[PDB]
Curated annotation (Swiss-Prot):
ATP binds at residues 35, 77, 96, 122. This is Heat shock protein HSP 90-alpha. It comes from Homo sapiens. Belongs to the heat shock protein 90 family. The chain holds residues 17 to 223 of 732 of the full protein. Signal peptide: none annotated.
Length: 207
């Protein structure tokens, strides 16, 4: 296991997300589904000129998996995945610059639900999760697990957990008071409200 420091700007973003009073937490799901869709779009585009890119799985989709025993909500996609370098580099984002914009905007009258407009929507996971684990597999690399409970650091390790073929799995270890996001009725409602026009199937698994 390797441990890394978040850039200071990202640590500050995370703390703002964790400590700011903001009731409309449910937007985290849309943000992560949006990220999944973007990743699926990337592998799809690469496949148009090189069909072999899909040897690691031709189905392009998103699964939502709640588990009340583990208190986790997992978002899985079969998108392009991320290399180890992408993981370290803010999960393939330009987060340093996105954070600066988001903070300026929060000053010009924006609110936290607008985070995705600044390219740092992944971090909205910390509205509801105490810990986030990201398992990822890109065609050009091995399978990796990133994890962070905030506090300024994240880890990266190889994952000999179940091989995934290709894609990304975001495992949200929910805060104790956020278990509503494990209820089928609630997840269904949020998907219909904010993720109605996504171009890939979204399957909500049953417990």
């Amino acid at each position: 296991v390797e441990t890394f420091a978040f850039q200071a700007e990202i640590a500050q973003l995370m703390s703002l997300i964790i400590n700011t009073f903001y009731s409309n937490k449910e937007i985290f799901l849309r943000e992560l589904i949006s990220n999944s869709s973007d990743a699926l779009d990337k592998i799809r585009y690469e496949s148009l000129t090189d069909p072999s890119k899909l040897d690691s799985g031709k189905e392009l989709h998103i699964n939502l998996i709640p588990n009340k025993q583990d208190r986790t909500l997992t978002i899985v996609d079969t998108g392009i995945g991320m290399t180890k370098a992408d993981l370290i580099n803010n999960l393939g984002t330009i987060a340093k610059s996105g954070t600066k914009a988001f903070m300026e905007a929060l000053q010009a009258g924006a609110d936290i639900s607008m985070i995705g407009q600044f390219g740092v929507g992944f971090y909205s996971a910390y509205l509801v999760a105490e810990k986030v684990t990201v398992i990822t597999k890109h065609n050009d690399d091995e399978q990796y697990a990133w994890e962070s409970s905030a506090g300024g650091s994240f880890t990266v390790r190889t994952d000999t957990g179940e091989p995934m073929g290709r894609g990304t799995k975001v495992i949200l270890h929910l805060k104790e008071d956020q278990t509503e996001y494990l209820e089928e009725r609630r997840i269904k409602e949020i998907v219909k409200k904010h993720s109605q026009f996504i171009g890939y199937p979204i399957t909500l698994f049953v417990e």
